[PDB]
Amino acid sequence: MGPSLDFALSLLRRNVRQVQTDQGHFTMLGVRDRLAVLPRHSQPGKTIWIEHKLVNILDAVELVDEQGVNLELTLITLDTNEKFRDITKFIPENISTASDATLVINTEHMPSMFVPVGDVVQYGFLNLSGKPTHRTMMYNFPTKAGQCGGVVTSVGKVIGIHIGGNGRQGFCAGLKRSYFA
Numbered sequence: 767m768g769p770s771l772d773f774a775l776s777l778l779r780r781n782v783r784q785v786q787t788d789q790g791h792f793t794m795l796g797v798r799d800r801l802a803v804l805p806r807h808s809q810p811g812k813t814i815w816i817e818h819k820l821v822n823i824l825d826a827v828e829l830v831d832e833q834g835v836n837l838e839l840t841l842i843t844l845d846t847n848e849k850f851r852d853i854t855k856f857i858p859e860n861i862s863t864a865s866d867a868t869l870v871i872n873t874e875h876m877p878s879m880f881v882p883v884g885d886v887v888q889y890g891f892l893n894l895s896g897k898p899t900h901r902t903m904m905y906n907f908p909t910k911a912g913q914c915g916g917v918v919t920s921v922g923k924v925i926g927i928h929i930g931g932n933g934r935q936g937f938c939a940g941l942k943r944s945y946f947a
């Protein structure tokens with residue numbers, strides 16, 4: 767087995783979780799410790815289904831940019847026994863683009879799904895379903911629903927959380943390492 771398959775499979779193994787909320791199925795990225803991240807619109811409550819059990823959520827923090835605008839990411843802190851593997855190092859310090867990116871989706875309905883989204887490029891601003899959102903990025907792939915949360919990865923870097931699509935294009939909320947400190 768080669769480099770990027772091993773990395774993307776290691777994430778599937780250790781960090782990417784199948785979850786469910788009143789809104790439906792999403793892919794959760796567990797980043798370190800008891801800290802996970804989901805799309806904002808996933809609308810996590812006081813509890814969240816994580817694969818085989820309902821997990822208590824202690825804290826939920828919806829992220830806004832300096833101008834108080836939506837980033838589309840919620841940092842959830844979980845009442846879970848054991849720490850997530852630390853992958854903060856894999857996350858760039860500032861939002862980065864990539865070439866030949868891979869969308870990693872893990873969901874009850876689409877488990878361990880690998881989607882070749884291609885080059886990822888700055889989009890900057892997206893409006894989805896009425897909410898104005900910053901620090902987004904774009905890939906030219908027809909991304910379907912139930913693929914939100916999916917993890918954008920290139921070459922051992924973890925660069926976005928999927929949040930949107932128009933049927934010809936996908937957009938993710940880019941990841942910054944400061945978010946998870």
Ligand SMILES: *[C@H](O)[C@H](C[C@@H]1CCNC1=O)NC(=O)[C@H](Cc1ccccc1)NC(=O)OCC(C)C
Nearest residue numbers: 807894895897909910911912914929930931932
């Ligand atoms: C999340 O599951 C879903 C995935 C979309 C649907 C088809 N392809 C995709 O990539 N995303 C959405 O439904 C978002 C909802 C949203 C996003 C940000 C803030 C609030 C709500 N909306 C969406 O894709 O709207 C269509 C736009 C005109 C591009």
